[PDB]
Amino acid sequence: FKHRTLPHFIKDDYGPESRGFVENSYLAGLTPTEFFFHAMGGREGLIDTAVKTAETG
Amino acid sequence: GPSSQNVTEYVVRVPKNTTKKYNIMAFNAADKVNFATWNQARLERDLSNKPEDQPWLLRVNGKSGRKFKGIKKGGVTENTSYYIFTQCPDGAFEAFPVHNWYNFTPLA
Amino acid sequence: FIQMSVQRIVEDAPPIDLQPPRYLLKFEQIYLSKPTHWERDGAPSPMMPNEARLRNLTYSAPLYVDITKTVIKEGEEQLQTQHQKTFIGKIPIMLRSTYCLLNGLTDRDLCELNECPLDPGGYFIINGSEKVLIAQEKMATNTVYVFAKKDSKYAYTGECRSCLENSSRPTSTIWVSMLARGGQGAKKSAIGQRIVATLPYIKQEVPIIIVFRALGFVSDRDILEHIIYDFEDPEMMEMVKPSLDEAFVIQEQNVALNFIGSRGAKPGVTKEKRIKYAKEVLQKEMLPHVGVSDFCETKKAYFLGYMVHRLLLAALGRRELDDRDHYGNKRLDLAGPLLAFLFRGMFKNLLKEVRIYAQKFIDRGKDFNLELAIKTRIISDGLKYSLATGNWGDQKKAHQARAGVSQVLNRLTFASTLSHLRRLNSPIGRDGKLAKPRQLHNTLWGMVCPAETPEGHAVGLVKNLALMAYISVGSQPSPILEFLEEWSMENLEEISPAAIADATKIFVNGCWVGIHKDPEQLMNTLRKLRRQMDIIVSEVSMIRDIREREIRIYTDAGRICRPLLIVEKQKLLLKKRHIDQLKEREYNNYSWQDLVASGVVEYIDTLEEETVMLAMTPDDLQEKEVAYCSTYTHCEIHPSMILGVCASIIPFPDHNQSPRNTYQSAMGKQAMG
Amino acid sequence: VGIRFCQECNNMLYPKEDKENRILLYACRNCDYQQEADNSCIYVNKITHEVDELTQIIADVSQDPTLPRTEDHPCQKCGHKEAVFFQSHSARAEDAMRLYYVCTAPHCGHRWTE
Amino acid sequence: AERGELDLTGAKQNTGVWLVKVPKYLSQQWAKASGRGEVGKLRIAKTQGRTEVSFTLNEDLANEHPFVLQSVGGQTLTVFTESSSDKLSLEGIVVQRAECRPAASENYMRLKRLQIEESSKPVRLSQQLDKVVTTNYKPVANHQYNIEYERKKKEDGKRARADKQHVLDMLFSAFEKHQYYNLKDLVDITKQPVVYLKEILKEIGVQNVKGIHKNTWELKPE
Amino acid sequence: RIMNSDENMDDDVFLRCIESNMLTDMTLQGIEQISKVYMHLPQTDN
Ligand SMILES: [Zn+2]
Ligand SMILES: [Zn+2]
């Protein structure tokens, strides 16, 4: 967003929880805002593998 | 003063006919044209377009004493009609319809 | 598409006056009938959707029109005549619509025709098959975007794709560039970069001051007040100075029109044709969304000035560049805005061949007959072809069309059917290695499912939308404009360009339509009208950015919405009185619609979602304390509605690793049931 | 440092030099209207670009519901004890983590850095 | 006294006029000027800090409108006329502009609804038909064909050719006016067969391309 | 100032050209193409 990561924070928040630090464990479950950032990381990690095969072959 | 005390009431009429079409002849206020300097004027539709749509050509104080070109506005009664309100000797008001808007500008 | 978008196409079509005498033809009204099948011996009968599947039929409905014909020979009489309900063609029908045979039936009758009461509908039956249309993404139109191509001669660039209210087959686009600084030369090193423009339908680049003078405004005190709105700014005026130096020798209107008129699709041999040619291209192809009439050319000057005033702000570093993948700059093409685009190119093609049949038939001077002029196989086989095969074009145009639309419905399991009728598609290539159109963007919160996407070569190119996401359908900006003018909004013509520095430019649907001097009271007056639905419908978005000092309003189709809960000072507006009467919809006639019309929920677009402050849960974020914020404006219903259809059947999905949730959502689509 | 417009044809007045009294004359290139220069300087180029954005931020930003607020720093010109602060949000972001404030009292609009 | 001559009298008299913007619905009421042309009453009250002007409708015309004064600054205007005798006259210069607005008599929403009442019909909607209308009729002779047949029976080309020399009177006749004529122009005069007409044309003349195809015959220069 | 030997194409535009030419083609120090040079001492045996 503009000066935000999600519409649930106030502008120019640089704290740890507001920019991706997931402080729970997979046994205690994640909160929604952490679920979303986790999805982002997973998505980029998923695209790189799709590229690598064709390139190396 | 009166402009600060002149309470009054006057009748308004809107005649269904007129002996002449009424138009607006706008002028640049920054130019501050002295109308007194206008001894005479000529007024003709512009010849570049070689009638009712024609832009006006105004020649004041001779052919080159003063000259302006008037360009018609896009609309005049597209949502609201414009009226000319004139004071009569009986104090009553007379309203005249604005047929068209022409924009007049100075010409080197 | 079938109540409004088809009536407007035939109604807004040029008559075919043709010729001695001459003739008239114009179309008035369109009708439709229920889908019908013509038996082998010519006896009609309504076809039910089941026989269409068994006998490999097609589910379509016939189309009529009223035509009136007047002969004009000034033969002391104007003879007119009309032929009403003339056959034209056949249109496919989407199942369960308002024009299907299954509209508004009860389960006792749906089972009697051998139909499933749980079938959702929303697909076509074409030659037995079941086709579904995929919503295509598209860059938003009628707005200014500022990018920076770091490879070519340009140091900055602007864009504006314009289309005049669903009436043009193409969409004219215009750039406003600015040349690079490090131009190796001992001449322009001192003056600097020159603002250039690349108009459509011309070969060569054009300086901006030239195209400004072609609209009048030859003086340089009048040009530099459309582009710079306050003359106490020396830093900007210095930047526009080297733009005048090259357009200094050409200093009058007619020679300017010749300059741009010299390089077109046809170089003019004479002079008057160039001055004619340059007149309309600068009048009907430049910014058609502002106004296409030959009058009102002061508006095309202001907007072209705002387009340039915004390009300089991006060079002084006062405003950030626009984002390409920001999901507030995208629109979606559903079945409506897709079949209407395909119906224009086949109605013009039907009128282009009534002439060819009339002229060949009127030179011999015999007479005219129209029931034999209409080639009915144009519209019938035109739609049915492109839907059945997918390429979004024509039959002899199997090479110039966009492919991948209109694929076959998936009927493997019931949750693979629903996940097919709700699917987007970004039209970029399927093998490009650029990651930025594939990665997950922050603006997809609550409107596109974050976990559900296929692997392989199409990662992140097709996407499914979330559960409560709602796409708008469109409306006419007429009733808001008539309210704005009566709420103290100065038009553009009747104002002085010096009363523009401390005013908030008011846009509506992309068009600059005035200014205002007290915006904060206008805004919370526009809003409390929408909350209770008097003049403004609930799907318009109204943005106000305090810093750039303007106000935008949208009414078009393609924007994506989702409902939220309205919050006053620090308490929800949903009192208990709304719940104990909402658990009784069965015999009370109180439902979702009576909830929107009472001002407790509200649809929030993506653009509007940047001027809002959300709370994720009431009982926990709206308690007075040493608190994060205190000016919450909205609240979510349940944060579990950010997932798609195939990803909301996973138990405890917030305990798994992320790539795992992507696999199952692409794997529960092929489970037997 | 500013700009000069002709008084007859409303165009851009260029600077010129006359070899008689050693004074800067501003001339036009459509007509030849003339006048002398009062500051006798033409070009200036600021490369430091250390413009303090206290001259560019607007007073109505205190109507934004998405900005943080404070009870610590009160306003000086009016004594109100509630402010709203933010960052530069512009270019020149090399060492740009200052914190400009704006008073939130109606019709005060006082701005100040720290 | 000339058409392009403009009277400057008004201007030179410094004649002043007033300019007022009026809504169309009111203006539509005004096209129905009560009786001859009576239409109401303007009321003007000026106080120390408030000058109030308003107009009230004629009781007849009816079967408070406050004024908003507008600036004529930036553009000082004048009024010029065209008589029904097409004479041209400048009546005056505009000394005031104003707008008639509603006040405490209507809410914005239903006022917008009143505009909606003014144009309240729905533009060409697509209606729903019942069953299917007849499309194919049973006509015997197409109407267009019958009109052509009647015209043909009027004239038959199969004419006779006696006293053939007379054409030449008509052909030469035409040939003196223009040196050459397209075969089609000659046919427009002689209704006899072209082959036989070409023999008559070839007998007394020769055909030149004249340079742009177009079979064209001319009298021999001898 | 310019060398006055030239005064016995306008000198103002020439002076602006020279001003806009010297601040980019200065060549104070270093080699033309290398732009940024860092500095550190390693800890590895590499
Ligand atoms: Zn000048
Ligand atoms: Zn204060």
From Swiss-Prot, chain B:
UniProt function note: TFIIF is a general transcription initiation factor that binds to RNA polymerase II and helps to recruit it to the initiation complex in collaboration with TFIIB. It promotes transcription elongation.
Domain of life (superkingdom): Eukaryota
Coiled coil: none
Gene it is expressed from: GTF2F1
Localization, UniProt: Nucleus
Subunit: Heterodimer of an alpha and a beta subunit. Interacts with GTF2F2, CTDP1, TAF6/TAFII80 and URI1. Interacts with GTF2B (via C-terminus and preferentially via acetylated form); this interaction prevents binding of GTF2B to GTF2F2.
Reported modifications of this chain: Phosphorylated on Ser and other residues by TAF1 and casein kinase II-like kinases.
Record protein name field: General transcription factor IIF subunit 1
Entry similarity comment: Belongs to the TFIIF alpha subunit family.
Induction profile: Up-regulated in response to enterovirus 71 (EV71) infection.
Swiss-Prot record, chain D:
GO BP, sorted A to Z: maintenance of transcriptional fidelity during transcription elongation by RNA polymerase II; transcription by RNA polymerase II; transcription initiation at RNA polymerase II promoter; transcription-coupled nucleotide-excision repair
Residues engaged in binding Zn(2+) 1: 6, 9, 28, 31
Matching Gene3D superfamilies: 2.20.25.10
Keyword DNA-binding: no
CDD domains: Zn-ribbon_RPB9
Function: DNA-dependent RNA polymerase catalyzes the transcription of DNA into RNA using the four ribonucleoside triphosphates as substrates. Component of RNA polymerase II which synthesizes mRNA precursors and many functional non-coding RNAs. Pol II is the central component of the basal RNA polymerase II transcription machinery. It is composed of mobile elements that move relative to each other. RPB9 is part of the upper jaw surrounding the central large cleft and thought to grab the incoming DNA template.
Subunit field text: Component of the RNA polymerase II (Pol II) complex consisting of 12 subunits.
Protein name: DNA-directed RNA polymerase II subunit RPB9
Origin species: Sus scrofa
Swiss-Prot record, chain E:
Disulphide connectivity of cysteines: none
Cellular location(s): Nucleus
Any one biological process term the GO annotation gives: transcription elongation by RNA polymerase II
Alphabetized UniProt keyword annotations: Acetylation, DNA-binding, Nucleus, Phosphoprotein, Transcription, Transcription regulation
A Gene Ontology term for the protein's cellular component: nucleoplasm
Entry binding sites for DNA: 211, 213
PTM sites of type N-acetylalanine: 1
GO molecular function: DNA binding; RNA polymerase II general transcription initiation factor activity
CDD domains: TFIIF_beta
Pfam families: TFIIF_beta, TFIIF_beta_N
Residue positions where Phosphoserine is found in the record: 126
N6-acetyllysine modifications at: 21, 32, 121
Protein family membership: Belongs to the TFIIF beta subunit family.
Quaternary context: Heterodimer of an alpha and a beta subunit. Interacts with HTATSF1 and GPBP1. Interacts with URI1. Interacts with GTF2B (via N-terminus); this interaction is inhibited in presence of GTF2F1.
Annotated function: TFIIF is a general transcription initiation factor that binds to RNA polymerase II and helps to recruit it to the initiation complex in collaboration with TFIIB.
Protein name (database record): General transcription factor IIF subunit 2
The organism of origin for this protein: Homo sapiens
